[PDB]
RNA sequence: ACGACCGUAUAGUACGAGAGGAACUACGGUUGGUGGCCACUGGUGUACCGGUUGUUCGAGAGAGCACGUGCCGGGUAGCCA
RNA sequence: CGAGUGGCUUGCUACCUCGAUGUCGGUUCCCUCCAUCCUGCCCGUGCAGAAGCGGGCAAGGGUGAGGUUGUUCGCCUAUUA
RNA sequence: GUCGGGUGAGAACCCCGACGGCCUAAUGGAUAAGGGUUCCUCAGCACUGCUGAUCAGCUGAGGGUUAGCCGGUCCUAAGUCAUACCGCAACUCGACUAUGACGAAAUGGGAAACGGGUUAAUAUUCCCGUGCCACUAUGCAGUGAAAGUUGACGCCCUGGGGUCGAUCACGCUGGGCAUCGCCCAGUCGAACCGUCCAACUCCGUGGAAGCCGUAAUGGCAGGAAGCGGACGAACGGCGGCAUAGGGAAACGUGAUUCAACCUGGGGCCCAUGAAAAGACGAGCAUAGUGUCCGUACCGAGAACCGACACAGGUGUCCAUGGCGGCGAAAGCCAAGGCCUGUCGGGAGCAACCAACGUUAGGGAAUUCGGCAAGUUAGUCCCGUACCUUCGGAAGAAGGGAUGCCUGCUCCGGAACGGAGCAGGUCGCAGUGACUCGGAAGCUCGGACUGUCUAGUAACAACAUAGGUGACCGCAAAUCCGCAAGGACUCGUACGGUCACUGAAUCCUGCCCAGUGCAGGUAUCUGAACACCUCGUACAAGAGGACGAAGGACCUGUCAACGGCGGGGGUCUUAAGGUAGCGUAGUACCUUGCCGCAUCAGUAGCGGCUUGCAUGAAUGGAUUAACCAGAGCUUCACUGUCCCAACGUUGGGCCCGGUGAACUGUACAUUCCAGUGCGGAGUCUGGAGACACCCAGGGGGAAGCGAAGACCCUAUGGAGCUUUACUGCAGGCUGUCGCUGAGGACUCUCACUCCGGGAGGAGGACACCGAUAGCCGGGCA
RNA sequence: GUGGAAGUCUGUUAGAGUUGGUGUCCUACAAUACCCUCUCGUGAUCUAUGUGUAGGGGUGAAAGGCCCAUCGAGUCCGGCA
């Protein structure tokens, strides 16, 4: 997490880097199969190490609050 | 005095140009004779150096292989379609007329066939509100209500990469790396920190702008700096 | 770093060379233009009235 | 090329109700200055002698280098305070 | 209130230098002046003594160390004849 | 450097030997650029060489550079040019769009070479031997043949394969030493041809419901382990090459750690890490062809740039030689190089100066200030405060240990790896040299890493993430161009432009009167064309009607410029200073008052505070961490001081040789006084004064150096500013032309934009040309 | 315990920078040098070569810094006696 930043940058900056990255690094449930093996491959790029499915998602999350509204509408 | 930075920009010298030779593709909707039959398969997902957002590689039926402005939720193997009769699923592109009102859209054309102009940055989207035989009313990400020819093509879904702005850069070095991929001069020296000869706000025994910051629309380049034709300033009221 | 003597050390770059057209060591091999006769820039020969006094 | 001060005897005296408290003279010492000197104390002393680290000359012996002594201990003459 | 002496301060003047006479303070090293702080020799005292106060001759010698401040100046401390 | 010796007319410095030293990422080896013959030989010394020279990078004359397989050449990169088109008064000018070409010699991509030998000087080029590539021809094979693969790729961590080197063991060959028995060198052998294959991926078998596996992550009924198999690596192993070559000889075998090279796994990105030619895909024999350019040498304390044989500057590779140790560190030493960072001889070698060692007792008294110097130091164990953004503070502080020798234990496959134990033992001192922090506290500033005045400023200044406001829907906002056109932009509001503030934390009050910007606007003002009236047989001209932007007027707006007082229990001019902070890096009075601390403190810190003249993104307060930033205090330390001494090395002094410059109206042995344009060696009066020379520290020559930077003057200059004067770009707006049909409206045919086209959008507007009004330090 | 992040620390590794000494030099070795000290040293890092931007114009993390010893408007020649 934010520990790599030492005593630099201040509270908000690193509290948010940790928050974003913790969610970022959480196990994510693949859209194709249902296994929790989705890992970020880069900015907005996600992939399942199980089946290999490579998806377009948010920058730090595979699903964004807006991408979800799409499914409905 | 000397030309101000905003003036050095226009000359298009190396310092101010985008590293175009390093860019991948000019994201534009494919051209279809008609019928809509055109479909393709997503072959890969790549990073777009010009937008800090993902983009999708697609192989079309007629052999054409082109990168595409990827909405969120598109993955390898998916089949995308482009045409009047395209199914109504995310990742597909069709004219605003064939799109059901109330659906989020991206990469909207300004005029039919221009390949897409609006809503293309990370995580954004337009909102098709009203239909008609003459006008398709779309709400752009800025919040504006835009009247467009219903023949203007668009892509179903919101642009991928949403939430990019949520994380702070934290350090100068991170901005640096991003700035190196854009047509921009960075870092930025404040005008008031310069000499009178270099900027209208330059000079003085201490740092402060000489005159008021709100400048007229009619001001000539070299003088148009600060708050341009500001209808108001501050936060109060 | 001193702009004088110490900065003279990096000067091992070849620019002006013997020109094919006029024979002067003025053909800038980087620009491919002779600063003396204009070769590479002009079919006509480089020449100006200010190269001599006004009434001569 | 000597200036000045402190102390002792004078004297708990002269003076003075008392409290307190001199001097001449003779002494001892200090301080500042001055000139010289090295028996004494002290400094230096890459003269010298010893110890010892690293390395090289195979070991030993005996040595070089480590800034103009590698470092540490002792230190004659001389020069000095 | 009146008469002066000095040429350290300040002010005035604009004589000297603008083809340049290197600044303040400090330091180091030398000479000097006396309107004398100490020392010598004296006079007066509201001079008992002791300790002083004031004055005269006198420039031989001495007039030191520190805390704040760039300070000069000055304030402060302990020594001091 | 020294002693001998060689050559020579001549020898400190040219050569030989010995002895003594210097250089170890360089003072060695190979090279890029750049130089250009400086390379080698012979002959020389008038020139050059910091002295000399028989020497030479000097002078003269000759000689020297050999390529199918090393580079160039070919490809394409950022980008450049040429032609066409268009612009421009015009071009040797100019942007776009086409086409074509150019653009990499160490260091991008890339068909192919190794070993030995040889010259005074070349060498993967010549010679000997061997190998290899491409093209073409002949012949056999082959119909396949272009899909695909490769070329071809970022940063961080890491496993495995593995050669050289280094080291260890043992044998052989040669050498060194001479109380031992040790120590050193060698022990060789290519390209290429052939073969082997770990990792990855995949197949079959198998059938795990908890097992499999890693340094780590991980893997699996969507099929784990095991087993069998396909594909598949090295500049590596192995065999050939090789009764080749090389060596005086022996002409080894194993091992560990393993640069090169090969091949995997993991992690990171608001960053995504070239392209093209070419190769592979796609067999073999024989033969022919393989032209053109480069190739010497230096590559630097003498061959390059810096006027010089200049202590400066100048890229790449050798990063694996030994000891040492964490180490590409120090110190010492090999290989290799050098004694050319090129003037010597003499004096115990004085004064004085440069670097520097040691100084008793005191210990910052020195000083603006601890400037300078000193102290501490490596490693292990113990232990560690306030504060804090919980990361840090921290190596806080403080305490202890540390060598050698003998015998051992533990970890590990092992190391010539690491961690310990017991006993013995020497010194003043065991990180014994070397290498190697002094520590603690208070306050100010900027959050941090970063940037900067090349050459007196490194800071508190700039930047920054973060906070905020402004403009813009893309035929945009902003900006460049005279134009043709162009940057932003392979971009599209989660964008990018224009500004302000400057991490975090707690916060950010009141004012829209002036100024700025913006919106609105009954009425007022507001140009030109067209229109109406007068005038003129026409015209000039006067006047009217209409009225755009703009202005008046109204409104919004301060995280817009900025403002936040005097008086009384409102007045100027809108408000009248809120949270906070405060004698401030802002406080004149001022060394403010009180306290802390000291013998004594214009300093420093804390409190008070009526603030000459604090205050909220002109940001206020505050703040952990960081800092060659400013001030202060303590411990430690010490030649900074009391107060100086002695010593070391290089000079200085004498001698040989070489050999400048500054400066010079003249005269000149001066001193004390005076005078003089008031600051005299020279005038006047006196005094003193025999001449010349050496060394010294610099009192005077208002010493030398520079037509004063300060100041003023000149109807001097320049940069900068603005509501100075006058104009000029640019923006807005009306009008005319392009421009057409039927104070408001439709249409389509010019014209503009979108679309490959069909066609769609817009449309007499816009663009462009002309002109009029307003704004207009952007510029002159 | 493993793992090995960082505009992270120590560091004369290479390399970059340039704080103090107001040392040496100041007709220099040098028209910006020498020595000691000192800062950075995985990153907004340093660097070679190629390449682009040109004078009221560039370039500028902004010092009026830099654009060949030349900068509050380069250099050359001309206007110009
Ligand atoms: Cl950004
Ligand atoms: Cl070559
Ligand atoms: Cl692995
Ligand atoms: K003057
Ligand atoms: Mg594009
Ligand atoms: Mg980060
Ligand atoms: Mg850029
Ligand atoms: Mg800034
Ligand atoms: Mg400034
Ligand atoms: Mg200006
Ligand atoms: Mg400010
Ligand atoms: Mg400001
Ligand atoms: Mg310059
Ligand atoms: Mg020695
Ligand atoms: Mg003088
Ligand atoms: Mg008297
Ligand atoms: Mg006297
Ligand atoms: Mg030669
Ligand atoms: Mg000869
Ligand atoms: Mg080419
Ligand atoms: Mg190459
Ligand atoms: Mg040779
Ligand atoms: Mg050669
Ligand atoms: Mg030399
Ligand atoms: Mg002492
Ligand atoms: Mg003191
Ligand atoms: Mg003092
Ligand atoms: Mg110091
Ligand atoms: Mg074991
Ligand atoms: Mg030590
Ligand atoms: Mg203060
Ligand atoms: Mg800072
Ligand atoms: Mg400077
Ligand atoms: Mg600094
Ligand atoms: Mg400096
Ligand atoms: Mg700042
Ligand atoms: Mg900001
Ligand atoms: Mg932001
Ligand atoms: Mg911002
Ligand atoms: Mg105070
Ligand atoms: Mg405010
Ligand atoms: Mg006379
Ligand atoms: Mg003058
Ligand atoms: Mg002036
Ligand atoms: Mg002027
Ligand atoms: Mg067009
Ligand atoms: Mg002007
Ligand atoms: Mg760092
Ligand atoms: Mg460091
Ligand atoms: Mg360059
Ligand atoms: Mg300035
Ligand atoms: Na200003
Ligand atoms: Na003068
Ligand atoms: Na003085
Ligand atoms: Na006296
Ligand atoms: Na004082
Ligand atoms: Na010599
Ligand atoms: Na092989
Ligand atoms: Na070693
Ligand atoms: Na750093
Ligand atoms: Na106002
Ligand atoms: Na206003
Ligand atoms: Na204020
Ligand atoms: Na810094
Ligand atoms: Na000393
Ligand atoms: Na003198
Ligand atoms: Na000027
Ligand atoms: Na952990
Ligand atoms: Na320095
Ligand atoms: Na100019
Ligand atoms: Na002229």
Neighbours of A70 (CB within 10 A): 20
Residues of A in contact with B44 (CB under 8 A): 54
Chains A and B touch (3+ CB pairs under 8 A): yes
Per-residue CA distances from B200 to A9, B4, B43, B207, C49 (Å): 33, 9, 53, 12, 42
Please give the Cα distance from A16 to A22 (Å, whole number): 10
In Å, what is the separation between the CA of B215 and the C1' of F547?
29
Q: Domain containing A42 — which CATH number?
A: 2.20.25.30
Listed resolution, Å? 2.4
* Strand ordering across the sheet containing B93-95: B93-95, B153-156, B104-106, B126-130, B136-139, B145-148
The CATH number for B82-159, chosen from 3.60.15.10, 2.30.30.30, 3.40.50.300, 3.90.1170.50, is 2.30.30.30
CB A58 within 8 A of CB A44: yes
The b-or-e profile of B36-63 (16+ CB within 10 A means b, else e) is bebbbebeebbbbebbbbbbbbbebeee
**Can you give the length of chain C in residues?**
56
Check whether domain B1-78 has CATH 2.40.50.140, yes or no: yes
Local structure of residue B29 (DSSP, 8 states):
P
In Å, what is the separation between the CA of C41 and the C1' of E11?
77
Can you list the alpha helix ranges (DSSP code H) found in chain A? 11-25, 65-72
Contact A7/B at CB under 8 A: no
**B183 token code pair:** 């047509």
Q: How many domains does chain A have?
A: 1
Q: Is A31 helix (H, G, I), strand (E, B) or coil?
A: coil
CA–C1' nearest nucleotide, residue B145:
F473
Any idea where the domains of chain B sit in the sequence? 1-78, 82-159, 160-237
Q: Which CATH class is domain B160-237?
A: few secondary structures
* Closest alpha carbon to B6 in B203, B195, B185: B185
Kindly list the structural domains of chain C, giving each domain's residue range(s) and its CATH number in brackets, ordered by start. 1-56 (2.20.25.30)
CB B125 within 8 A of CB B155: no
Is C43 annotated to bind a ligand? Reply is: no
User: Would the CB atoms of A64 and B76 count as touching at under 8 Å?
Assistant: no
Question: B130 - beta bridge partners?
Answer: B137
Range of the domain at A8: 1-73
Phi and psi dihedrals of C37, rounded to 5?
A: -105, -10
């Amino acid at each position: 997490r934010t520990g790599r930043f030492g005593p630099r940058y201040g509270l908000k900056i690193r509290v948010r880097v940790a928050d974003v990255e913790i969610k970022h690094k959480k196990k994510h449930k693949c859209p194709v199969c249902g296994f929790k093996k989705l890992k970020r491959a880069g900015t907005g790029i996600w992939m399942c190490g199980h089946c290999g499915y490579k998806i377009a998602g948010g920058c730090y999350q595979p699903e964004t609050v807006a991408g979800k509204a799409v499914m409905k509408a | 005095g000397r030309r101000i930075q905003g003036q050095r920009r226009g000359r298009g010298t190396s310092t101010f140009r985008a590293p175009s030779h390093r860019y991948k593709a000019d994201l534009e909707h494919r051209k279809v004779e008609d019928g809509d039959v055109i479909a393709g398969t997503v072959v890969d997902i790549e990073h777009d150096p010009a937008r800090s957002a993902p983009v999708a590689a697609v192989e079309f039926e007629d052999g054409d292989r082109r990168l595409i402005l990827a909405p969120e939720g598109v993955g390898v193997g998916d089949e995308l379609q482009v045409g009047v009769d395209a199914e109504i699923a995310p990742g597909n592109t069709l004219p605003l007329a064939e799109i059901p009102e109330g659906v989020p859209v991206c990469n909207v054309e300004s005029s039919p066939g221009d390949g897409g102009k609006f809503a293309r940055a990370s995580g954004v989207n337009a909102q098709l509100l009203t239909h008609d035989r003459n006008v398709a009313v779309v709400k752009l990400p800025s919040g504006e209500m835009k009247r467009l020819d219903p023949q203007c093509r668009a892509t179903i879904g919101v642009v991928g990469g949403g939430g990019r702005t949520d994380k702070p850069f934290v350090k100068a070095g991170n901005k640096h790396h991003k700035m190196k991929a854009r047509g921009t001069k960075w870092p930025n020296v404040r005008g008031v920190a310069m000499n009178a000869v270099d900027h209208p706000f330059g000079g003085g025994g201490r740092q402060h702008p000489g005159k008021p910051k709100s400048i007229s629309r009619n001001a000539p380049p070299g003088r148009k700096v600060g708050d341009i034709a500001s209808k108001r300033t501050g936060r109060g009221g | 770093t001193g702009a004088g003597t110490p900065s003279q050390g990096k000067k091992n770059t070849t620019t002006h060379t013997k020109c094919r057209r006029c024979g002067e060591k003025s053909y800038h091999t980087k620009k491919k233009v002779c600063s003396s006769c204009g070769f590479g820039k002009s079919a006509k020969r480089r020449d100006y009235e200010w190269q001599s006094k006004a009434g001569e």
